[PDB]
Design a protein around this ligand. Structure first.
Ligand code: FMN
Ligand code: 7Z5
Ligand code: DET
Ligand code: DOR
Length: 359
């Protein structure tokens, strides 16, 4: 009903940003039905120092300001990541800044880190901090994704601020150095810049009290050169980074895009990104010898999509764009299909399938 009627009818009435705002509101108010699908033990994953009751999370960008976390767990996500959050509030780019490519099952966005800022999000998370502590213990962890202000003159200091303010409230933190929509940000993926940045981030993280000490992951682009990926793997292993998120949106425009809006500036997400992301997961898993947990993201809209990223080396996956086309039912669909495929392919559970292609 969502895929065939409601979503198509909604998208025909609201521009994508308005639709997004409404979706966040509806979710935060808990207007959706509580998901029927009950997670089986097969879907449980233990990684990053936590239990995840299922491996399917909501990717950063949907709940940028931490407004809909509980509604998202109700939707059936096994973990929630909010953000990106910047130190000071900022408006992001002028509108329009989000575009649907329905013929491609893709989206292009250039939000530019519109963010309520650390202080607002801090108090928002504090208001439900003990509820989250129980959810986490129950296998439903919370990630917080950190960004940088447009006018900041010290990128490392922006991330350090984010570690200090939201680190205590997060099960894991994400150093997002892969947004295509903030000038100069992706250059922080370079070896020397990344090592300096992550050394500072990890020191700030290590200075937090033990029970408030998050895992730290780095989120990378799908558009890296082979040299870029080798350098990132090297730095991650040198510094003991806890994990990678692979990938952000692509600035590439793959041959074959049909959408009228295909040449809008911004990051491309959804199906055209899927296999580019999967191959990046595959490479980073190999470069890190399977020792570094990967959250695989990009174009996941089915159980097969999820399992392909898991077999390529992901311990967990996330989705966003699929939600915008298929709506809330896609979460249970992905989980149900993933369980069936795991059984069909001889895996006792998700854990057995992680990196299976490499063996
Ligand atoms: C509208 C939109 C906003 C996004 N905002 C962020 C963000 O703030 N921080 C971040 O790390 N990734 C952000 N992303 C990237 C997603 O987290 C994800 O990496 C990417 O969309 C690929 O997954 P998908 O194809 O399932 O959407 C955004 C994506 C979209 C579509
Ligand atoms: C790319 C910008 C973006 O986020 N877009 C959307 C996000 C959610 C939804 N829903 C209506 C799904 C939904 C419905 C109710 C609750 N949660 C999610 C639709 C869209 C859309 O663009 O049509
Ligand atoms: C309020 C301080 C400046 C940033 C405002 C951000 C508004 C965010 C609106 C909901 C999220 N969305 C991506 C749909 O705009
Ligand atoms: O990390 C990010 C940032 C986001 C934005 O434009 O705010 N757009 C994206 O596609 N990825």
């Amino acid at each position: 009903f969502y895929a065939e009627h409601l979503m198509p009818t909604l998208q025909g009435l609201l521009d994508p940003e308005s639709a997004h705002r409404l979706a966040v509101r509806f979710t935060s108010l808990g207007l959706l039905p509580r998901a029927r699908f009950q997670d089986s033990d097969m879907l449980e994953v233990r990684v990053l120092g936590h239990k995840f009751r299922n491996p399917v999370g909501i990717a950063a960008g949907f709940d940028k300001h931490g407004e809909a976390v509980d509604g998202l767990y109700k939707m059936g996500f096994g973990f929630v990541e909010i953000g990106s959050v910047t130190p000071k509030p900022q408006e992001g780019n002028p509108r329009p800044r989000v575009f649907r490519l329905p013929e491609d099952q893709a989206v292009i966005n250039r939000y530019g880190f519109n963010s309520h800022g650390l202080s607002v999000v801090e108090h928002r998370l504090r208001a439900r901090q003990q509820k989250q502590a129980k959810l986490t213990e129950d296998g439903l962890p919370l990630g917080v994704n950190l960004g940088k202000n447009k006018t900041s003159v010290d990128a490392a200091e922006d991330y350090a601020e984010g570690v200090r303010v939201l680190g205590p409230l997060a099960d894991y933190l994400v150093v997002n150095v892969s947004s295509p929509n903030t000038a100069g940000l992706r250059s922080l993926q370079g070896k020397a810049e990344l090592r300096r940045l992550l050394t500072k981030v990890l020191q700030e993280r290590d200075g937090l009290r033990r029970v408030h000490r998050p895992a730290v992951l780095v989120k990378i682009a799908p558009d890296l050169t082979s040299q870029d990926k080798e350098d990132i793997a090297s730095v991650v292993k040198e510094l003991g980074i806890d994990g990678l998120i692979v990938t952000n949106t692509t600035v590439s425009r793959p041959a074959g895009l049909q959408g009228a809006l295909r040449s809008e500036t911004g990051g491309l997400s959804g199906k055209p990104l899927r296999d580019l992301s999967t191959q990046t997961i595959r490479e980073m898993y190999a470069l890190t010898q399977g020792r570094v947990p990967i959250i695989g993201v990009g174009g996941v809209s089915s159980g097969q999509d999820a399992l392909e990223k898991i077999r390529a080396g992901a311990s967990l996956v996330q989705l966003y764009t699929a939600l915008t086309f298929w709506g809330p039912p896609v979460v249970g669909k992905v989980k149900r299909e993933l369980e069936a495929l795991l059984k069909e392919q001889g895996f006792g559970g998700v854990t057995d399938a992680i990196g299976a292609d490499h063996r």
